Amino acid sequence: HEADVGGIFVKVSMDGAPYLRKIDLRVYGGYSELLKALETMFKLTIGEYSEREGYKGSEYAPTYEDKDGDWMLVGDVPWDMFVTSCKRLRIMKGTEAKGLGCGVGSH
């Protein structure tokens, strides 16, 4: 089933430091490459969605915009629902992610 690859484009920005990247939701076909891509983006290692806080990200919390317009860290919804609902993409340092770390999440 490869007819939905590269269609919904996501726009990604960095906070505290200037960066301009852009990617597509479908091109990962799963969470593995999703997480791996982030590690690729800024050439470092993103912490996974630890089910306890899932917003820590170590130093970077990858966040997305859902249909409600709320920004959470990836790993909240499962891929199948996730891809069709994510609108925007923002990954940024934990010092800022701590702001949207809804209910004990980041730093």
Which domains, ranges and CATH numbers included, belong to the chain?
1-107 (3.10.20.90)
Return d(Cα 91, Cα 18) in angstroms, integer: 12
Q: Please, which experimental method was used?
A: NMR
Extended strands (E) in the chain: 9-13, 20-24, 60-65, 71-73, 89-93
Residue 36 tokens read as 């791996």
CA geometry: angle 90, 93, 98, nearest 5 deg: 90
